[PDB]
Amino acid sequence: RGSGIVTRCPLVLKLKKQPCEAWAGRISYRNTELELQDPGQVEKEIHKAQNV
Amino acid sequence: DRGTEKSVMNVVRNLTYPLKKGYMIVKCRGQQEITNRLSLAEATKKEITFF
């Protein structure tokens, strides 16, 4: 929510249910994948991603 | 140890990779095992036990 936080780049959310334990990752536009493990680390990392 | 290494384990277990003669795991033998050059009977005994 922040102090008015919003998209600075287009943002691609891909969602698929699976019986396997929760996992999220991300992709930077310099052809770098990153492992986020459980999706608690998502919210901050996807703002941090856009910034760079 | 981590969820990171347990995911790789799940992905190899189900054979998503092509290899028709498949996968396997061996222990590497420890740092103390290499120091003394211990008998292979103990390496067999150790290996079977750890898995």
Side-chain angles (χ1 to χ4, degrees):
Chain A
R1 307 286 170 106
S3 57
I5 305 313
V6 69
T7 33
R8 304 319 199 303
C9 289
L11 173 68
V12 191
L13 164 59
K14 181 204 298 178
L15 299 160
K16 300 278 157 68
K17 53 167 194 293
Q18 278 310 54
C20 59
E21 283 171 338
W23 180 108
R26 76 182 171 99
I27 300 175
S28 174
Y29 217 57
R30 294 289 179 275
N31 293 132
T32 283
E33 288 198 68
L34 176 62
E35 303 191 291
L36 302 176
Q37 302 201 112
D38 75 306
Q41 294 306 327
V42 172
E43 53 185 298
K44 65 169 48 194
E45 275 293 306
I46 65 88
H47 206 196
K48 154 178 179 200
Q50 285 180 91
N51 264 336
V52 164
Chain B
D1 184 2
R2 284 74 50 82
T4 57
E5 290 82 61
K6 193 190 79 170
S7 181
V8 169
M9 294 298 153
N10 292 341
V11 174
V12 88
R13 183 175 153 218
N14 293 332
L15 201 66
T16 295
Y17 307 114
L19 304 178
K20 305 312 182 68
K21 298 312 176 55
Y23 72 78
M24 248 266 99
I25 176 149
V26 296
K27 174 67 180 189
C28 49
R29 305 192 69 166
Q31 278 44 250
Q32 288 71 92
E33 286 168 73
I34 195 264
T35 294
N36 301 302
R37 304 296 203 179
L38 296 173
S39 72
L40 279 179
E42 287 207 301
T44 301
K45 185 44 165 63
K46 283 185 58 167
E47 175 161 71
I48 288 175
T49 308
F50 180 69
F51 298 161

